[PDB]
Design a protein around this ligand. Structure first.
Ligand SMILES: *[C@@H]1O[C@H](CO)[C@@H](O[C@@H]2O[C@H](CO)[C@@H](O)[C@H](O)[C@H]2NC(C)=O)[C@H](O)[C@H]1NC(C)=O
Ligand SMILES: *[C@@H]1O[C@H](CO)[C@@H](O)[C@H](O)[C@H]1NC(C)=O
Ligand SMILES: *[C@@H]1O[C@H](CO)[C@@H](O)[C@H](O)[C@H]1NC(C)=O
Ligand SMILES: *[C@@H]1O[C@H](CO)[C@@H](O)[C@H](O)[C@H]1NC(C)=O
Ligand SMILES: *[C@@H]1O[C@H](CO)[C@@H](O)[C@H](O)[C@H]1NC(C)=O
Ligand SMILES: *[C@@H]1O[C@H](CO)[C@@H](O)[C@H](O)[C@H]1NC(C)=O
Lengths: 596, 100
């Protein structure tokens, strides 16, 4: 005879009854991905839509309760995880027409069709093969030609859709008590009521800028040193004391800088430690790489994977006579049956990606007691973080010399550790400033400060602030400079990549606190250490019913955004960059252009 | 169809067969349990691909009522071989003894 009784009743129903439908959707998408047939596409034609409809109905029947005076706080956490009505929040016509416009204006970008004016027989596609013609093109001018052709072919029609979307999406969430539609994913894990373990939506933007004062001696030094090694292949187009053109990178805008590594090796006489020669011995397959992974997974302390994983997913080759998908995806099927959407072969990257999904599985099963709607990570960027740090721990030289991958007598080279640090850094810490600067500007624009006619011109001006990506020529309102990324077309949750990177190596540091690894960092396994397994056991079980930073504050020691772990991970790399930056400059003279 | 709604727990040797709507709010539900009202006995929703504790388990748990009544059911108490012409401590059908 109160709000509490019926609230707890219908949510106790909802947990299990909607976990059933989520499991149905997960198995449908699984059957499609594993078996690309004529009717498996229907597996999604009735799964996601029905899940969204059930979410909407449950939210509608749940919001009739005040959901504020109830003594329990987890009930509100799943209730505030239920209040994502989505789509129509202000008006049916405007919201639904914008969503239908998105339905085609996202696939127009995903089409990846390029019709070169020279010859239509050459095209540029959004497939990874483009990295061989943009990220790793042999000719110097071919990269610039590919960039200009790609832009002029895909971005001509992307301006009005993006402009109208950004203009008209604010009020939908503004009537949803969210400051702009960016508040949908900026403050997903924003909870009030209890001090200390709380978050603020406006705190993120203000904390973005001031936390990079100590990042600069690391990221800026890495940018400056590597730049000195770009001169050997780009004559009269480098200016190491200044900036570099946008087509001189492993990414078209500046996300990935690792594709310049082969050109920018510190010492090229010694290669990085590779495990491929190890598979020369007996050719570790997925069913064997997974088993040998348990040497640093059973000894941790946490149990094995699900017993149903080793009986349903394919092991050798999903192809056979059956089309299938084996892309890197973090899957949480639910109902105690969690599996990996990946087949592992002879490849260091395949070896890494093998552990990502199984660490994800371990994370998901570690909090089986969480509510179904709360059966996720701390936020968007914490579920995948600990899931992938186990993948990042596969290529550990102190652990590679244990299972025949490397003989445990070869001494670590002068720069091979530094070589691997620099190679890995350009992908993870060379991408963080992208979200640090451009995403922060994007949130400011979502706040509404930029006018109608400053979207493209101002991008070049503020790219001369932190990231340092410059272009030979600017463009007027006839190209698609700012919003031309795969993840910026549909306001994708970049916090899942932001709090991912800021809170990246703190998990490994917390793993190594009781592992007694003080000399070498950035490579350390938790094998034969029960304390390490049981101290982040709280990390893998916190989920969403617990505060997002309970185990984080209790174990890691950094409740809010932390800068020290990033510098400590690359501490040998940071010291090397700060030491071997002689006869050069560290800062960027942004007021410079080679074309002019 | 395992039951999920009841007013209270179950008493010793108490069986529930009525699918009564679990009223919790003073507002009458009545008829079809719809708005803020729901039916009992939620389904398993089981599928052949689950974990460990997600499958049906048959139970024939014993709760024998060993009161002051005489015991009808007893132990099988099997027999041994039969011995003739030499002394044994026979225990035929209750009556003990010793002889040939
Ligand atoms: C964890 O402890 C185990 C068990 O002592 C060790 O793994 C073995 O160590 C021996 C050396 O004594 C080597 O043959 C291999 O490294 C392991 N062999 C087998 C069959 O597992 C080792 O101390 C630790 N394991 C690691 C570091 O992987
Ligand atoms: C979602 O829809 C319900 C049902 O109309 C409504 O009560 C609620 O205010 C809406 N918004 C949120 C954030 O729940
Ligand atoms: C959850 O609700 C229970 C009552 O059902 C209460 O005892 C408990 O303290 C609540 N937990 C939180 C975190 O509010
Ligand atoms: C891990 O141990 C469990 C014990 O319950 C069992 O499923 C099996 O031995 C292991 N599972 C694996 C290796 O997937
Ligand atoms: C599943 O894949 C098999 C081959 O692996 C083949 O029978 C077909 O593609 C699928 N089976 C169906 C759709 O019944
Ligand atoms: C690494 O090479 C440097 C020269 O660049 C020199 O100090 C020495 O040969 C090596 N240093 C160490 C610490 O091994």
């Amino acid at each position: 005879s109160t709000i509490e009784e019926q609230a707890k009743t219908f949510l106790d129903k909802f947990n299990h009854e909607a976990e059933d439908l989520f499991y149905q959707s997960s198995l449908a998408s699984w059957n499609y991905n594993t078996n690309i047939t004529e009717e498996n596409v229907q597996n999604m034609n009735n799964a996601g839509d029905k899940w969204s409809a059930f979410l909407k109905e449950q939210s509608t029947l749940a919001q009739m309760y005040p959901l504020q005076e109830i003594q329990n706080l987890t009930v509100k956490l799943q209730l505030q995880a239920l209040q994502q009505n989505g789509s129509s929040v202000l008006s049916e016509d405007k919201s639904k027409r914008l969503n239908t416009i998105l339905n085609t204006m996202s696939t127009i970008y995903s089409t990846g069709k390029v019709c070169n004016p020279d010859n239509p027989q050459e095209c540029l596609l959004l497939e990874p093969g483009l990295n061989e013609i943009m990220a790793n093109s042999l000719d110097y001018n071919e990269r610039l030609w590919a960039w200009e052709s790609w832009r002029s072919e895909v971005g001509k029609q992307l301006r009005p859709l993006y402009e109208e979307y950004v203009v008209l999406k604010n009020e939908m969430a503004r009537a949803n008590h969210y400051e702009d539609y960016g508040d949908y994913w900026r403050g997903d894990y924003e909870v009030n009521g209890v001090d200390g373990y709380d978050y603020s939506r406006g705190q993120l933007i203000e904390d973005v800028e001031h936390t990079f004062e100590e990042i600069k001696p690391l990221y800026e030094h890495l940018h400056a040193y590597v730049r000195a090694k770009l001169m050997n292949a780009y004559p009269s187009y480098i200016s190491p004391i200044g900036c570099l053109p946008a087509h001189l990178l492993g990414d078209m805008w500046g996300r990935f800088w690792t594709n310049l590594y082969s050109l920018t090796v510190p010492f090229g006489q010694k290669p990085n430690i590779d495990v491929t020669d190890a598979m020369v011995d007996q050719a570790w397959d997925a069913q064997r790489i997974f088993k040998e992974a348990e040497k640093f997974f059973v000894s941790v302390g946490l149990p094995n994977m699900t017993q149903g994983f080793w009986e349903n997913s394919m092991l050798t080759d999903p192809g056979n006579v059956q089309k299938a998908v084996c892309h890197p995806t973090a899957w949480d099927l639910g109902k105690g049956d969690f599996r990996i959407l990946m087949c592992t072969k002879v490849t260091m990257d395949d070896f890494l990606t093998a552990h990502h999904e199984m660490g994800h599985i371990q994370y998901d099963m570690a909090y089986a007691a969480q509510p179904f709607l709360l059966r996720n990570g701390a936020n968007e960027g914490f579920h995948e973080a600990v899931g992938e740090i186990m993948s990042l721990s596969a290529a550990t030289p102190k652990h590679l010399k244990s299972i025949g991958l490397l003989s445990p007598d070869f001494q670590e080279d002068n720069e091979t550790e530094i070589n691997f640090l620099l190679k890995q850094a350009l992908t993870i810490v060379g991408t963080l400033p992208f979200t640090y600067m451009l995403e922060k500007w994007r949130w400011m624009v979502f706040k509404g400060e930029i006018p109608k006619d400053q979207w493209m011109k101002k991008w070049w001006e503020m790219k001369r602030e932190i990231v340092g990506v410059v272009e030979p020529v600017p463009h007027d309102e006839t190209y698609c400079d700012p919003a031309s990324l795969f993840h910026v077309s549909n306001d994708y949750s970049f916090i899942r990549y932001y709090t991912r990177t800021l809170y990246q190596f703190q998990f490994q540091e917390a793993l190594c606190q009781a592992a007694k690894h003080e000399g070498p960092l950035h490579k350390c396994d938790i094998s034969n250490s029960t304390e390490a397994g049981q101290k982040l056991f709280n990390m893998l079980r916190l989920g969403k019913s617990e505060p997002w930073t309970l185990a984080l504050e209790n174990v890691v020691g950094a409740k809010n955004m932390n800068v020290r772990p990033l510098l400590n991970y690359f501490e040998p790399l940071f010291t090397w960059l700060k030491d071997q930056n002689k006869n050069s400059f560290v800062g960027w003279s942004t007021d410079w252009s080679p074309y002019a | 169809l395992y039951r999920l709604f009841r007013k209270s727990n179950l008493k010793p040797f108490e069986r529930d067969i009525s699918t009564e709507i679990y009223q919790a709010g003073n507002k009458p539900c009545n008829g079809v349990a719809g708005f803020n009202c729901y039916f009992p006995l939620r389904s398993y929703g089981f599928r052949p691909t689950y974990g460990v504790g997600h499958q049906p388990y048959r139970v024939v748990v014993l709760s024998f009522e060993l009161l002051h009544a005489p015991a009808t059911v007893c132990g099988p108490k099997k027999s041994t071989n039969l011995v003739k012409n030499k002394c044994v401590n026979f225990n035929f059908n209750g009556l003990t003894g010793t002889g040939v």
